[PDB]
A paper describes a structure:
Our previous work identified NP338 as an immunodominant CD8+ T cell epitope in individuals expressing HLA-B3739. Our conservation analysis of the NP338 viral peptides across vaccine and circulating IAV strains, including pH1N1, H5N1, and H7N9, found 16 natural variants of NP338 peptide, with the most common mutations occurring at position (P) 5, 6, and 7 of the peptide. To understand the molecular basis of cross-reactive TCRαβ recognition, we solved the structure of NP338 and its variants bound to the HLA-B37 molecule, as well as the structure of a cross-reactive TCR in complex with HLA-B37-NP338. Thus our data demonstrate that CD8+ T cell cross-reactivity in the context of NP338 peptide and its variants is favored by similar conformations adopted by the epitopes.
The NP338 peptide could bind each of the three HLA molecules (HLA-B37, -B18, and -B*44:05); however, the stability of HLA-B37-NP338 was superior by 6 °C to HLA-B18-NP338 and by 14 °C to HLA-B*44:05-NP338. We then solved the binary structures of the NP338 peptide presented by HLA-B37, HLA-B18, and HLA-B44. Similar to the HLA-B37-NP338 structure, the NP338 peptide was anchored to HLA-B18 and HLA-B44 by P2-Glu and P9-Phe. However, the NP338 peptide adopted a strikingly distinct conformation when bound to HLA-B37 as compared with HLA-B18 (r.m.s.d. of the peptide 1.7 Å) and HLA-B44 (r.m.s.d. of 1.8 Å for the peptide). In HLA-B18, P5-Arg is partially buried in the D-/E-pocket and only exposed its guanidinium group to the solvent, stabilized by a salt bridge with the peptide P3-Asp. Polymorphism at position 116 between the two HLA molecules change the architecture of the peptide. The HLA-B18 contains a small Ser116, while the HLA-B37 has a large Phe116. As a result, P9-Phe of the peptide is anchored deeper in the cleft in the HLA-B18 molecule, which would sterically clash with the P5-Arg conformation observed in HLA-B37. In addition, the salt bridge observed in HLA-B37 between Asp77 and P5-Arg would be lacking in HLA-B18 due to the presence of Ser77. The hydrophobic nature of the interaction between the EM2 TCR and the NP338 peptide is complementary with the conformation of the NP338 peptide bound to HLA-B37 that presents only the hydrophobic residue to the TCR. This might explain the lack of response for NP338 when presented by both HLA-B18 and HLA-B44 molecules, in which the peptide presents its charged P5-Arg to the TCR.
Residue numbers in the entry:
A (entry chain C): 0 to 99
B (entry chain A): 1 to 276
C (entry chain B): 1 to 9
The structure:
């Protein structure tokens, strides 16, 4: 059947300030079917107990979800999101960039 | 301004992994206020915004009963839809419905909505007349005939013009401090050199509510539609939204570029430039 | 309140 691959954005709730607690978000959207796997990573390692929004969808029927967790950005720590979906042969990793 | 109440239903079959999960979420504009999940340990309609919490036990009990009935009806619908498309019992399928109403600043009905999709494609929809149907294909024509025989559209019109709008107006009053408050975007322009001959200008909009916003770049007063990278408006997790627009500009030509921002919360539209 | 459609597709 016809399927839609997720769009992925990784970003912070508040403007990033090194050493200030914030929230790291991974917004997945535009996908169909609704099953999807999302991990938030700190230095390549899975962050435990990440929360997510309730499943809903857009006017074009595609689904969206927000995954989120507390994080304290620093100069050296690397954050990312890892997404898998039926449309993807391999998990897609998007790195957090405070400029995006 | 104008407002909407919308419910979003998703039912997904998973052969070999039990019965199809049913999820319903309700929104007023961009604010979710309820959820129900048949996979929860104890399925119940639950509040998701502070202002709905004051509703009494009857509200929670009746919406939970509707949802529990829907969990079963959607499973029957999925079985019927599998047969309408001659599909195997092996595959997973999705049924979605979105319905609700819209009102203007005077609280009067603008229009109602009721639309459904199967496997992410339009299946059947109630027309704006709230009296006739549009079926996508010969399978949906079976549903249409069934719903026409039972005069479902007349029942939906009565809900959409009655209960729907009465409850949207009630939610708007109970949540007026947030639902009827537009928060403007906080904005700034960043500059990122790419090479010796080009740089990126990125226009940011943060902290706004509702999600509707216009964010564009102009070069010498001409819209840069094709040349702008525009990310989807995204939720911050504090009810607000974020968006940015970027353009790649020749080094030294930055002042020919202006970022234009329109949003309900702003006293006036903004014109921004890179400020070194 | 939500609507209630008891008739399946």
């Amino acid at each position: 059947m016809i399927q839609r691959t997720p769009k992925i954005q990784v970003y912070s709730r508040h403007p990033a300030e090194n050493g200030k607690s914030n929230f790291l978000n991974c917004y997945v959207s535009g996908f169909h079917p609704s099953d999807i796997e999302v991990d938030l990573l700190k230095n390549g390692e899975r962050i435990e107990k990440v929360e997510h929004s309730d499943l809903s969808f857009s006017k074009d029927w595609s689904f969206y979800l927000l995954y989120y967790t507390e994080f304290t950005p620093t100069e050296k720590d690397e954050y990312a999101c890892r997404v898998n979906h039926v449309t993807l042969s391999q998990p897609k990793i998007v790195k957090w960039d405070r400029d995006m | 301004g104008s407002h909407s109440m919308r419910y979003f239903h998703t039912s997904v079959s998973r052969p070999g992994r039990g019965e199809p999960r049913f999820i319903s979420v309700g929104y007023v504009d961009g604010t979710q206020f309820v959820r129900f999940d048949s996979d929860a340990a104890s399925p119940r309609t639950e509040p998701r915004a502070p202002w709905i919490e004051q509703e009494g036990p009857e509200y929670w009990d009746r919406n939970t009963q509707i949802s529990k009935t829907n969990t079963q009806t959607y499973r029957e619908s999925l079985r019927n839809l599998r047969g309408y498309y001659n599909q195997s019992e092996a595959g997973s399928h999705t049924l979605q419905r979105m319905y609700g109403c819209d009102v203007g600043p005077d609280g009067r009905l603008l229009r109602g909505h009721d639309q459904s999709a199967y496997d992410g494609k339009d299946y059947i929809a109630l027309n704006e007349d709230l009296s006739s149907w549009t079926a996508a294909d010969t399978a949906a024509q079976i549903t249409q005939r069934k719903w026409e025989a039972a005069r479902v559209a007349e029942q939906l019109r009565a809900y959409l013009e009655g209960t729907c709008v009465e409850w949207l107006r009630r939610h708007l009053e109970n949540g007026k401090e947030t639902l009827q408050r537009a928060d403007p975007p906080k904005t700034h322009v960043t500059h990122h050199p790419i090479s010796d001959h080009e740089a990126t200008l990125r226009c940011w909009a943060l902290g706004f509510y509702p999600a509707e916003i216009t964010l564009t770049w102009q070069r010498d007063g001409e819209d840069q539609t094709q040349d702008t990278e525009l990310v989807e408006t995204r939720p911050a997790g504090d009810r607000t939204f974020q968006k940015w627009a970027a353009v790649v500009v020749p080094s030294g030509e930055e002042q020919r570029y202006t970022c234009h921002v329109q949003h309900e919360g702003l006293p006036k539209p903004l014109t921004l430039r890179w400020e070194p | 309140f939500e609507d209630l459609r008891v008739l399946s597709f």
